[PDB]
Design a protein around this ligand. Structure first.
Ligand SMILES: *C(=O)C[C@H]1C[C@@H](C)C(=O)/C=C/C(C)=C/[C@H](CO[C@@H]2O[C@H](C)[C@@H](O)[C@@H](OC)[C@H]2OC)[C@@H](CC)OC(=O)C[C@@H](O)[C@H](C)[C@H]1O[C@@H]1O[C@H](C)[C@@H](O[C@H]2C[C@@](C)(O)[C@@H](O)[C@H](C)O2)[C@H](N(C)C)[C@H]1O
Ligand SMILES: [Mg+2]
Ligand SMILES: [Mg+2]
Ligand SMILES: [Mg+2]
Ligand SMILES: [Mg+2]
Ligand SMILES: [Mg+2]
Ligand SMILES: [Mg+2]
Ligand SMILES: [Mg+2]
Ligand SMILES: [Mg+2]
Ligand SMILES: [Mg+2]
Ligand SMILES: [Mg+2]
Ligand SMILES: [Mg+2]
Ligand SMILES: [Mg+2]
Ligand SMILES: [Mg+2]
Ligand SMILES: [Mg+2]
Ligand SMILES: [Mg+2]
Ligand SMILES: [Mg+2]
Ligand SMILES: [Mg+2]
Ligand SMILES: [Mg+2]
Ligand SMILES: [Mg+2]
Ligand SMILES: [Mg+2]
Ligand SMILES: [Mg+2]
Ligand SMILES: [Mg+2]
Ligand SMILES: [Mg+2]
Ligand SMILES: [Mg+2]
Ligand SMILES: [Mg+2]
Ligand SMILES: [Mg+2]
Ligand SMILES: [Mg+2]
Ligand SMILES: [Mg+2]
Ligand SMILES: [Mg+2]
Ligand SMILES: [Mg+2]
Ligand SMILES: [Mg+2]
Ligand SMILES: [Mg+2]
Ligand SMILES: [Mg+2]
Ligand SMILES: [Mg+2]
Ligand SMILES: [Mg+2]
Ligand SMILES: [Mg+2]
Ligand SMILES: [Mg+2]
Ligand SMILES: [Mg+2]
Ligand SMILES: [Mg+2]
Ligand SMILES: [Mg+2]
Ligand SMILES: [Mg+2]
Ligand SMILES: [Mg+2]
Ligand SMILES: [Mg+2]
Ligand SMILES: [Mg+2]
Ligand SMILES: [Mg+2]
Ligand SMILES: [Mg+2]
Ligand SMILES: [Mg+2]
Ligand SMILES: [Mg+2]
Ligand SMILES: [Mg+2]
Ligand SMILES: [Mg+2]
Ligand SMILES: [Mg+2]
Ligand SMILES: [Mg+2]
Ligand SMILES: [Mg+2]
Ligand SMILES: [Mg+2]
Ligand SMILES: [Mg+2]
Ligand SMILES: [Mg+2]
Ligand SMILES: [Mg+2]
Ligand SMILES: [Mg+2]
Ligand SMILES: [Mg+2]
Ligand SMILES: [Mg+2]
Ligand SMILES: [Mg+2]
Ligand SMILES: [Mg+2]
Ligand SMILES: [Mg+2]
Ligand SMILES: [Mg+2]
Ligand SMILES: [Mg+2]
Ligand SMILES: [Mg+2]
Ligand SMILES: [Mg+2]
Ligand SMILES: [Mg+2]
Ligand SMILES: [Mg+2]
Ligand SMILES: [Mg+2]
Ligand SMILES: [Mg+2]
Ligand SMILES: [Mg+2]
Ligand SMILES: [Mg+2]
Ligand SMILES: [Mg+2]
Ligand SMILES: [Mg+2]
Ligand SMILES: [Mg+2]
Ligand SMILES: [Mg+2]
Ligand SMILES: [Mg+2]
Ligand SMILES: [Mg+2]
Ligand SMILES: [Mg+2]
Ligand SMILES: [Mg+2]
Ligand SMILES: [Mg+2]
Ligand SMILES: [Mg+2]
Ligand SMILES: [Mg+2]
Ligand SMILES: [Mg+2]
Ligand SMILES: [Mg+2]
Ligand SMILES: [Mg+2]
Ligand SMILES: [Mg+2]
Ligand SMILES: [Mg+2]
Ligand SMILES: [Mg+2]
Ligand SMILES: [Mg+2]
Ligand SMILES: [Mg+2]
Ligand SMILES: [Mg+2]
Ligand SMILES: [Mg+2]
Ligand SMILES: [Mg+2]
Ligand SMILES: [Mg+2]
Ligand SMILES: [Mg+2]
Ligand SMILES: [Mg+2]
Ligand SMILES: [Mg+2]
Ligand SMILES: [Mg+2]
Ligand SMILES: [Mg+2]
Ligand SMILES: [Mg+2]
Ligand SMILES: [Mg+2]
Ligand SMILES: [Mg+2]
Ligand SMILES: [Mg+2]
Ligand SMILES: [Mg+2]
Ligand SMILES: [Mg+2]
Ligand SMILES: [Mg+2]
Ligand SMILES: [Mg+2]
Ligand SMILES: [Mg+2]
Ligand SMILES: [Mg+2]
Ligand SMILES: [Mg+2]
Ligand SMILES: [Mg+2]
Ligand SMILES: [Mg+2]
Ligand SMILES: [Mg+2]
Ligand SMILES: [Mg+2]
Ligand SMILES: [Mg+2]
Ligand SMILES: [Mg+2]
Ligand SMILES: [Mg+2]
Ligand SMILES: [Mg+2]
Ligand SMILES: [Mg+2]
Ligand SMILES: [Mg+2]
Ligand SMILES: [Mg+2]
Ligand SMILES: [Mg+2]
Ligand SMILES: [Mg+2]
Ligand SMILES: [Mg+2]
Ligand SMILES: [Mg+2]
Ligand SMILES: [Mg+2]
Ligand SMILES: [Mg+2]
Ligand SMILES: [Mg+2]
Ligand SMILES: [Mg+2]
Ligand SMILES: [Mg+2]
Ligand SMILES: [Mg+2]
Ligand SMILES: [Mg+2]
Ligand SMILES: [Mg+2]
Ligand SMILES: [Mg+2]
Ligand SMILES: [Mg+2]
Ligand SMILES: [Mg+2]
Ligand SMILES: [Mg+2]
Ligand SMILES: [Mg+2]
Ligand SMILES: [Mg+2]
Ligand SMILES: [Mg+2]
Ligand SMILES: [Mg+2]
Ligand SMILES: [Mg+2]
Ligand SMILES: [Mg+2]
Ligand SMILES: [Mg+2]
Ligand SMILES: [Mg+2]
Ligand SMILES: [Mg+2]
Ligand SMILES: [Mg+2]
Ligand SMILES: [Mg+2]
Ligand SMILES: [Mg+2]
Ligand SMILES: [Mg+2]
Ligand SMILES: [Mg+2]
Ligand SMILES: [Mg+2]
Ligand SMILES: [Mg+2]
Ligand SMILES: [Mg+2]
Ligand SMILES: [Mg+2]
Ligand SMILES: [Mg+2]
Ligand SMILES: [Mg+2]
Ligand SMILES: [Mg+2]
Ligand SMILES: [Mg+2]
Ligand SMILES: [Mg+2]
Ligand SMILES: [Mg+2]
Ligand SMILES: [Mg+2]
Ligand SMILES: [Mg+2]
Ligand SMILES: [Mg+2]
Ligand SMILES: [Mg+2]
Ligand SMILES: [Mg+2]
Ligand SMILES: [Mg+2]
Ligand SMILES: [Mg+2]
Ligand SMILES: [Mg+2]
Ligand SMILES: [Mg+2]
Ligand SMILES: [Mg+2]
Ligand SMILES: [Mg+2]
Ligand SMILES: [Mg+2]
Ligand SMILES: [Mg+2]
Ligand SMILES: [Mg+2]
Ligand SMILES: [Mg+2]
Ligand SMILES: [Mg+2]
Ligand SMILES: [Mg+2]
Ligand SMILES: [Mg+2]
Ligand SMILES: [Mg+2]
Ligand SMILES: [Mg+2]
Ligand SMILES: [Mg+2]
Ligand SMILES: [Mg+2]
Ligand SMILES: [Mg+2]
Ligand SMILES: [Mg+2]
Ligand SMILES: [Mg+2]
Ligand SMILES: [Mg+2]
Ligand SMILES: [Mg+2]
Ligand SMILES: [Mg+2]
Ligand SMILES: [Mg+2]
Ligand SMILES: [Mg+2]
Ligand SMILES: [Mg+2]
Ligand SMILES: [Mg+2]
Ligand SMILES: [Mg+2]
Ligand SMILES: [Mg+2]
Ligand SMILES: [Mg+2]
Ligand SMILES: [Mg+2]
Ligand SMILES: [Mg+2]
Ligand SMILES: [Mg+2]
Ligand SMILES: [Mg+2]
Ligand SMILES: [Mg+2]
Ligand SMILES: [Mg+2]
Ligand SMILES: [Mg+2]
Ligand SMILES: [Mg+2]
Ligand SMILES: [Mg+2]
Ligand SMILES: [Mg+2]
Ligand SMILES: [Mg+2]
Ligand SMILES: [Mg+2]
Ligand SMILES: [Mg+2]
Ligand SMILES: [Mg+2]
Ligand SMILES: [Mg+2]
Ligand SMILES: [Mg+2]
Ligand SMILES: [Mg+2]
Ligand SMILES: [Mg+2]
Ligand SMILES: [Mg+2]
Ligand SMILES: [Mg+2]
Ligand SMILES: [Mg+2]
Ligand SMILES: [Mg+2]
Ligand SMILES: [Mg+2]
Ligand SMILES: [Mg+2]
Ligand SMILES: [Mg+2]
Ligand SMILES: [Mg+2]
Ligand SMILES: [Mg+2]
Ligand SMILES: [Mg+2]
Ligand SMILES: [Mg+2]
Ligand SMILES: [Mg+2]
Ligand SMILES: [Mg+2]
Ligand SMILES: [Mg+2]
Ligand SMILES: [Mg+2]
Ligand SMILES: [Mg+2]
Ligand SMILES: [Mg+2]
Ligand SMILES: [Mg+2]
Ligand SMILES: [Mg+2]
Ligand SMILES: [Mg+2]
Ligand SMILES: [Mg+2]
Ligand SMILES: [Mg+2]
Ligand SMILES: [Mg+2]
Ligand SMILES: [Mg+2]
Ligand SMILES: [Mg+2]
Ligand SMILES: [Mg+2]
Ligand SMILES: [Mg+2]
Ligand SMILES: [Mg+2]
Ligand SMILES: [Mg+2]
Ligand SMILES: [Mg+2]
Lengths: 275, 48
RNA sequence: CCGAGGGUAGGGCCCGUGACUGGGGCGAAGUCGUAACAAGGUAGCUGUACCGGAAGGUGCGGCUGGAU
RNA sequence: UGGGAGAGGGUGGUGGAAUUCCCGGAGUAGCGGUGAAAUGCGCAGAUACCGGGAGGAACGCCGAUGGCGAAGGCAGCCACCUGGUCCACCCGUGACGCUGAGGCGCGAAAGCGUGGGGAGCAAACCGGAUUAGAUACCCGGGUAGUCCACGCCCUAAACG
RNA sequence: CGAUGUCGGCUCGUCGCAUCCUGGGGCUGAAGAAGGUCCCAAGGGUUGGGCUGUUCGCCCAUUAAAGCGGCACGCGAGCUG
RNA sequence: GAAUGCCGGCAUGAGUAACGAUAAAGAGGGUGAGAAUCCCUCUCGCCGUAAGCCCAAGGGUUCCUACGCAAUGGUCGUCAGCGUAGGGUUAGGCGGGACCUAAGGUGAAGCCGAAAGGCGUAGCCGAAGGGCAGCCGGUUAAUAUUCCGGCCCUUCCCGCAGGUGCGAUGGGGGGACGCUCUAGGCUAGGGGGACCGGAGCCAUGGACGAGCCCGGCCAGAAGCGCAGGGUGGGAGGUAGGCAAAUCCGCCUCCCAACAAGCUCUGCGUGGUGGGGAAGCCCGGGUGACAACCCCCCGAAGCCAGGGAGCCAAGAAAAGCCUCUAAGCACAACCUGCGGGAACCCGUACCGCAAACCGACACAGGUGGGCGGGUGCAAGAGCACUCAGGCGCGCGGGAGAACCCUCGCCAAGGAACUCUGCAAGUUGGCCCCGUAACUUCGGGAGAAGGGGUGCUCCCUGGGGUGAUGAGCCCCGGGGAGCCGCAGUGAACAGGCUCUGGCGACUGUUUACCAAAAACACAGCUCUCUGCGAACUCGUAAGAGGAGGUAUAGGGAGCGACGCUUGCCCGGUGCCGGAAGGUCAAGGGGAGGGGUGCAAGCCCCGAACCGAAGCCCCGGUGAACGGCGGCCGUAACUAUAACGGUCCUAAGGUAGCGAAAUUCCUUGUCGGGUAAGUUCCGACCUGCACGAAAAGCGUAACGACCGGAGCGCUGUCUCGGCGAGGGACCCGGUGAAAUUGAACUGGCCGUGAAGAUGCGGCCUACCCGUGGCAGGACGAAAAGACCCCGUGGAGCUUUACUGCAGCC
RNA sequence: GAGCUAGCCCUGGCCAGGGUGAAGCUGGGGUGAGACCCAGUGGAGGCCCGAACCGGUGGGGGAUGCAAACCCCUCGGAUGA
């Protein structure tokens, strides 16, 4: 339930902010934070390799448990649900009956006080991680490993999910958040349910400074530059594109496919995406 | 207005100093050149 | 002190009038089509929506005040 | 108090038929469509047939001249939550009633906002015919919409 | 072209006369008054405003009249821009 | 003898401009060869959120003293940041190092690169961040938290005593964190006192007073007091914190829990040690046995790691504490006490500036702290002043034009002009009051108006204290007084109506453009399944991202509202296992050379053989494109209607003489006395039109039009006045420019605009203040134009390559 | 060569005073319960006025300057991109 503001400034007119209603703890676990080295889009050469990055709020990185097969069979209590600025989803603090503490990304509907567990024997309940092969077909699932023991790669953003379509040998078939149909190995882990904070996508930033807070520096259009800068630079007055619309580096940017031709994972993509 | 020379002893030694020059092929040719020319000073004076 | 009234400024209602513009009523014998009345030749009407020189057409749902 | 019938309403599940699409097999010279045709689709292997898969929507027979609701309206099946109503008994209250300007709520379809969803259908739109024309009727396509959630709109041959 | 600053305005004048007014004339299809046309005449004079960068022009209100041209389309080591 | 030649020297312009903020000077007395300029005194003026004071950087002896005045100093100079010499900087506690980590840098491992080198985990380095022990006064010509005095404190070594399972680079805890708002209690700092201390003072009409003037504190260990911060205690279980663990984490039990207790800071007091004015007298000495007390205001600082709220979610590591491991428990650690030990570098001076950055003793630039008082509603604003510091390193006269900065102006009031450019006006606060429209916030300080000083009287509430007095902060009523005028000085909106553009706050061409340009939230298309796409790199490696389609890249459009039509023939992109073409390679019909021959060698047809292209489809918020001629209605005119040619399809809604309209000042209407602009309309749109978006839109704008009111020196049309210059005198003394010059007018002539030629006219020699017509005046080898088989940036379906990708 | 300038990274600092008065909270009203209305409290914002600070709108001066971009008046931002 995104929160609105009354129009008492020009920008407050449209700005919306998250309700933060699921959050139950407002300072991170000291033993699970570590400093996040802001890059500004600069690589080890010092060169900008991703334009328009930099200048956002300072952040600490919360270490997230993307394996969970670390701790097969050991139950844990959901101690709190907190804000994480490094991702769109909320995170859940887990108190394992081990004494060990860990963060996972918080699925939708997960309640403080419940217990979650990971392993082949786990109940098909929101928050439990199982190898893909042991989850019944049809089950909506998130934080899915792409390869066994390599870490949860898919469906981690707020509100996303994957759905199990069927099984074929050592592989289960997932419908990813993009609508792609892909085979993922059955020994890959995944967590029952969809990621929470689904209302994330209905946030109206509201003003330019709000983008500055997230580390997004202004994006300048190619049509606004000169020919030394961009395929769309120049012209007297305004100008249509005047050529197939291109990126700063010349490649076409309205339809040109760019997935590598002979990539080995093609044998595992069943059907490209949608809409 | 603010002009271009804004002296800074650390900046000066870290940029043109003897050790900066020795750390780099082009920097060593500089020293080799200024010795061959007979410069009294191979490197900018800076009081540290 | 109040005080006819005069002055300054800003409002409310009404009336007349205005380049141009909207449709309306009326007008013996104009131009285009033929929508409706027969199953009117696609049953008609209907609220709405979109479209078309025009009457209209079409979609969705509704009515019989529809014929056989 | 004791019972009854019912597509009355809301929520969560879930079943089979059919259409479309995709995959695999088999198979070949047409399929489709109309008053007749053409557009379209088809030897880059369509139609027709089998097995497999995905998805959306609507629930055949029962079904009726039937039932329920105040009206709009409500039809697979299951559970939960909930309204109205009828009958029996003649037990309780003791006229506590009727109507109802305003008010408030509900209110088919289309339409609108924000997300979703999208099989079939189909305003707009394109093509093929027909025709003097044909911004129609008929044929091939086809986008909103039709579907879900929340919020609007508040209309009707909302009729007995 | 080893640079002659280029429109208009403002300021400051000066000159020509093919004369707008004022002075003197002849002819008139000059009754008078008022005009028309030509001749002589450059002494002086020849307004304020609305519009436009404007020159020019149109318009308003006047006037004896609201002249036309030259001076590097007079005048930026005088100003404006 | 010429090259705007080169190096040097010296001229001209010229005793000319200038002498660097218009804060400002006058006199007396010294010194000295010499004095507007040095020293001293008195008077005057200027700064005072600085033009005072303290840090940091940078500078590097400029500091202090004596002796100097050639040059430096915009004049002068006896003076000086100048010359010569001598002197001067003192630390266990201040700052840095022998401590820690940040970005970043470096880099055993390892990775990569022709070479040079590029990466890179740990580790190391790296600070204005973390951590860490000194306060007050005195003293020097010049240093002082450094020397001295008083009172405090830290670490290391050794010893004594008491205690304890001691022990670490290892585990854990802690360190440890945002933004805005903010509580209680204090301190800094300040105001007042009829109280306390003081040299004195009574003037010129009055005052010997509850008179005037000055001052009334600072530091402090333990202890104690006040106000805060931090912190649960015990037991049992335990599989986690990469060994161990009694620690930490997790579970259960009991108890303590708005507490308490323990601990730690701040403030107060505190033995003690200091300080101590005006005035007078010569920095000192007195004052002085100085006094050192009460009331109030009160922080943005302190208690602090305090509290609340919010979303954009807010360093690390050491010190410190705890846990144990080897080890060792004659050790070792902890606590108390004692003695001893305690190194290196900086320290002068300037520091919003004459010592730093600007070539200058340059009106510019330079981070942090303190920054008093009164009044003006507040304040760091403004005026005047404290402490303190200055009068800006040429002066003296005069009182022209003209220039700058400033003041006033009769009558008029935008008539000025491209334009009200500029300058008026308005101006703070309190109260009354306030329109269209609107996204319901706004528009709004709309507009417009009233009040504002002083005296007396009555009086309400808040803070302090005690509830009172006193102090203090906000008021309320009544009656008066004075002036032209009461935010009496200073600081402080002119307003309205109506268009265009852009939603808005923002951003930009450092040094001619601040805008309608860029950005912007938002909308759409498109790519990307993760070793992502994409970007930098030869690579390794990075960024993307310790992210994962509600995400990341690319493109266009640009809040919001209502919308965004038709064309896929061409280009692009997407799809298509067929067909066509297609390179190397395979294949080897058939040839050729050579040899006696076996053979060796060469050519080579059919045929098999990718991407690409061809071909078949799709696709517009992909590149783009969206007709012509002729006829037609019962007045005329016009043409709903029709005919025909063409196209891939012939521009829809909306808007329109427009930031677009050539003809054009279109035509009509409005406003004006008059309107090429403006506004409203019309539509033959030269040449609008739907995300290079179309049409609107409240609010917003140092944007650009048009109008009105107010008010004005803008103007009719100028006048006067002020100061800084200009002018004269003393001092110092440039510049561009310059073939040489004994350098007039007219009419001609001449390479076509003559001081210089011809003819005539005019004209004694030389200056000073002024004006700009000429010297085709100066400046810059025209920046326009052209030429050169000159150059460079940019483009593409120009040529040819290369990266990249297939 | 990034001691100027542009962007980013790390670590610190700074922003007088005044004005407006969002959400929420509380109380009251209202209702079947609600929505909602009123008052108080509260203190939000690329909010308003205005110093420091950051700018550089218009005009004037300056143009061998005080200055190879300055000076005066005026003007923009000033809790935020
Ligand atoms: C072209 O620019 C040449 C220029 C003359 C040269 C000598 C030159 O550059 C002069 C510069 C000057 C006098 C600068 C003055 C100082 O400005 C200030 O300088 C300081 C250092 C700086 O910090 C700033 O101070 C704040 C800076 O302020 C801007 C400056 C003061 C305004 O003066 C000028 O700018 C004048 C300059 O324009 C000067 C007059 C120029 O000469 C003219 O050059 C043009 C090109 C030429 O005219 C052309 C125009 C055409 C081509 O259309 C054509 O019609 C004409 C015929 O030629 C003109 N002349 C006609 C030849 C020259 O006079
Ligand atoms: Mg809102
Ligand atoms: Mg609202
Ligand atoms: Mg949440
Ligand atoms: Mg940590
Ligand atoms: Mg990184
Ligand atoms: Mg690196
Ligand atoms: Mg990029
Ligand atoms: Mg970047
Ligand atoms: Mg993310
Ligand atoms: Mg989150
Ligand atoms: Mg797999
Ligand atoms: Mg979104
Ligand atoms: Mg952020
Ligand atoms: Mg942009
Ligand atoms: Mg451009
Ligand atoms: Mg450009
Ligand atoms: Mg470039
Ligand atoms: Mg290029
Ligand atoms: Mg290019
Ligand atoms: Mg272009
Ligand atoms: Mg162009
Ligand atoms: Mg352009
Ligand atoms: Mg153009
Ligand atoms: Mg451009
Ligand atoms: Mg083009
Ligand atoms: Mg291109
Ligand atoms: Mg590519
Ligand atoms: Mg896909
Ligand atoms: Mg600068
Ligand atoms: Mg600097
Ligand atoms: Mg330094
Ligand atoms: Mg330094
Ligand atoms: Mg440095
Ligand atoms: Mg370096
Ligand atoms: Mg060095
Ligand atoms: Mg080398
Ligand atoms: Mg070498
Ligand atoms: Mg030497
Ligand atoms: Mg040397
Ligand atoms: Mg060197
Ligand atoms: Mg009267
Ligand atoms: Mg009909
Ligand atoms: Mg009919
Ligand atoms: Mg019909
Ligand atoms: Mg139709
Ligand atoms: Mg076929
Ligand atoms: Mg075949
Ligand atoms: Mg589907
Ligand atoms: Mg019934
Ligand atoms: Mg009874
Ligand atoms: Mg309805
Ligand atoms: Mg026909
Ligand atoms: Mg020329
Ligand atoms: Mg010359
Ligand atoms: Mg010249
Ligand atoms: Mg004039
Ligand atoms: Mg005359
Ligand atoms: Mg002319
Ligand atoms: Mg004209
Ligand atoms: Mg006359
Ligand atoms: Mg003339
Ligand atoms: Mg001419
Ligand atoms: Mg001409
Ligand atoms: Mg001229
Ligand atoms: Mg001229
Ligand atoms: Mg000029
Ligand atoms: Mg001129
Ligand atoms: Mg000239
Ligand atoms: Mg001149
Ligand atoms: Mg001249
Ligand atoms: Mg101009
Ligand atoms: Mg010669
Ligand atoms: Mg020369
Ligand atoms: Mg030369
Ligand atoms: Mg020379
Ligand atoms: Mg020379
Ligand atoms: Mg010389
Ligand atoms: Mg010599
Ligand atoms: Mg000389
Ligand atoms: Mg001379
Ligand atoms: Mg002279
Ligand atoms: Mg001069
Ligand atoms: Mg000078
Ligand atoms: Mg000078
Ligand atoms: Mg001054
Ligand atoms: Mg005197
Ligand atoms: Mg004197
Ligand atoms: Mg002197
Ligand atoms: Mg002297
Ligand atoms: Mg003096
Ligand atoms: Mg003196
Ligand atoms: Mg005197
Ligand atoms: Mg003061
Ligand atoms: Mg001297
Ligand atoms: Mg001298
Ligand atoms: Mg000497
Ligand atoms: Mg000198
Ligand atoms: Mg000087
Ligand atoms: Mg002497
Ligand atoms: Mg010294
Ligand atoms: Mg000491
Ligand atoms: Mg040592
Ligand atoms: Mg280092
Ligand atoms: Mg440090
Ligand atoms: Mg220290
Ligand atoms: Mg101390
Ligand atoms: Mg001292
Ligand atoms: Mg112990
Ligand atoms: Mg912490
Ligand atoms: Mg932290
Ligand atoms: Mg910190
Ligand atoms: Mg905040
Ligand atoms: Mg104190
Ligand atoms: Mg005070
Ligand atoms: Mg235990
Ligand atoms: Mg254990
Ligand atoms: Mg004393
Ligand atoms: Mg004594
Ligand atoms: Mg502060
Ligand atoms: Mg604190
Ligand atoms: Mg670290
Ligand atoms: Mg042992
Ligand atoms: Mg032993
Ligand atoms: Mg040592
Ligand atoms: Mg010192
Ligand atoms: Mg300054
Ligand atoms: Mg400072
Ligand atoms: Mg100084
Ligand atoms: Mg000076
Ligand atoms: Mg200076
Ligand atoms: Mg002050
Ligand atoms: Mg004081
Ligand atoms: Mg005030
Ligand atoms: Mg302050
Ligand atoms: Mg002075
Ligand atoms: Mg000064
Ligand atoms: Mg001076
Ligand atoms: Mg004089
Ligand atoms: Mg002045
Ligand atoms: Mg007067
Ligand atoms: Mg006057
Ligand atoms: Mg007026
Ligand atoms: Mg007037
Ligand atoms: Mg005017
Ligand atoms: Mg104007
Ligand atoms: Mg102008
Ligand atoms: Mg004022
Ligand atoms: Mg109005
Ligand atoms: Mg109003
Ligand atoms: Mg208005
Ligand atoms: Mg309006
Ligand atoms: Mg309103
Ligand atoms: Mg007012
Ligand atoms: Mg008001
Ligand atoms: Mg009053
Ligand atoms: Mg008075
Ligand atoms: Mg009076
Ligand atoms: Mg104001
Ligand atoms: Mg703007
Ligand atoms: Mg703009
Ligand atoms: Mg716009
Ligand atoms: Mg807008
Ligand atoms: Mg916008
Ligand atoms: Mg702003
Ligand atoms: Mg420029
Ligand atoms: Mg500029
Ligand atoms: Mg420049
Ligand atoms: Mg511009
Ligand atoms: Mg601006
Ligand atoms: Mg721009
Ligand atoms: Mg914008
Ligand atoms: Mg938009
Ligand atoms: Mg989208
Ligand atoms: Mg690259
Ligand atoms: Mg290489
Ligand atoms: Mg990373
Ligand atoms: Mg833009
Ligand atoms: Mg609207
Ligand atoms: Mg096309
Ligand atoms: Mg096509
Ligand atoms: Mg195409
Ligand atoms: Mg085309
Ligand atoms: Mg349309
Ligand atoms: Mg028009
Ligand atoms: Mg017109
Ligand atoms: Mg227009
Ligand atoms: Mg046009
Ligand atoms: Mg025109
Ligand atoms: Mg024109
Ligand atoms: Mg006209
Ligand atoms: Mg008119
Ligand atoms: Mg104009
Ligand atoms: Mg027309
Ligand atoms: Mg375009
Ligand atoms: Mg355009
Ligand atoms: Mg507006
Ligand atoms: Mg603006
Ligand atoms: Mg603006
Ligand atoms: Mg006006
Ligand atoms: Mg004047
Ligand atoms: Mg004067
Ligand atoms: Mg004389
Ligand atoms: Mg002299
Ligand atoms: Mg001299
Ligand atoms: Mg000569
Ligand atoms: Mg001569
Ligand atoms: Mg002469
Ligand atoms: Mg002469
Ligand atoms: Mg000639
Ligand atoms: Mg001549
Ligand atoms: Mg002559
Ligand atoms: Mg001669
Ligand atoms: Mg001759
Ligand atoms: Mg001659
Ligand atoms: Mg002669
Ligand atoms: Mg003569
Ligand atoms: Mg003279
Ligand atoms: Mg003169
Ligand atoms: Mg002249
Ligand atoms: Mg001349
Ligand atoms: Mg010449
Ligand atoms: Mg000349
Ligand atoms: Mg040359
Ligand atoms: Mg030339
Ligand atoms: Mg040139
Ligand atoms: Mg140029
Ligand atoms: Mg030419
Ligand atoms: Mg050529
Ligand atoms: Mg040639
Ligand atoms: Mg060439
Ligand atoms: Mg190459
Ligand atoms: Mg920098
Ligand atoms: Mg630096
Ligand atoms: Mg501020
Ligand atoms: Mg404040
Ligand atoms: Mg107020
Ligand atoms: Mg309030
Ligand atoms: Mg609250
Ligand atoms: Mg603001
Ligand atoms: Mg205000
Ligand atoms: Mg001005
Ligand atoms: Mg200035
Ligand atoms: Mg000013
Ligand atoms: Mg402001
Ligand atoms: Mg402020
Ligand atoms: Mg902030």
């Amino acid at each position: 339930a995104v929160k609105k503001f009354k129009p008492y400034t020009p920008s407050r007119r449209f700005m919306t902010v998250a309700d933060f209603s699921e959050i139950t703890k407002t300072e991170p676990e000291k033993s699970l934070v570590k400093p996040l080295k802001k890059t500004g889009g600069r690589n080890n050469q010092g060169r900008i390799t991703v334009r328009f990055r930099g200048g956002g709020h300072k952040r600490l990185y919360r270490i997230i448990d993307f394996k969970r097969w670390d701790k097969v069979g050991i139950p844990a209590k959901v101690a709190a649900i907190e804000y994480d600025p490094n991702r769109s989803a909320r995170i859940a603090l887990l108190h394992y009956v081990d004494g060990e503490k860990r963060y996972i990304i918080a699925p939708d509907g997960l309640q403080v006080g419940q217990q979650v567990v990971a392993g082949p024997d786990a109940p098909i309940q929101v928050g439990n991680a199982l190898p893909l092969r042991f989850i019944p077909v049809g089950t909506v699932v998130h934080a899915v490993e792409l390869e066994p023991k390599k870490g949860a790669k898919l469906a981690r953003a707020a509100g996303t999910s994957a759905q199990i379509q069927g099984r074929e040998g050592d592989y289960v078939i997932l419908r990813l958040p993009s609508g792609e149909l892909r085979k993922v190995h059955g020994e890959c882990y995944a967590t029952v349910g969809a990621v929470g904070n689904a209302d994330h996508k209905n946030i109206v930033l509201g003003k330019a400074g709000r983008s500055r807070w997230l580390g997004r520096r202004p994006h300048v259009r190619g049509a606004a530059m000169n020919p030394v800068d961009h395929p769309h630079g120049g012209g007297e007055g305004r100008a249509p594109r005047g050529r197939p619309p291109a990126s700063p580096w010349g490649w076409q940017t309205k339809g040109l496919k760019t997935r590598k031709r002979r990539k080995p994972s093609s044998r595992f993509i069943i059907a490209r995406r949608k809409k | 207005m603010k002009r271009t020379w804004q002296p800074n002893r650390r900046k000066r030694a870290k940029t043109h100093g003897f050790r900066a020059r020795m750390r780099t092929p082009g920097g060593r040719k500089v020293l080799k050149r200024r010795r061959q020319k007979g410069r009294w000073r191979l490197t900018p004076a800076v009081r540290k």
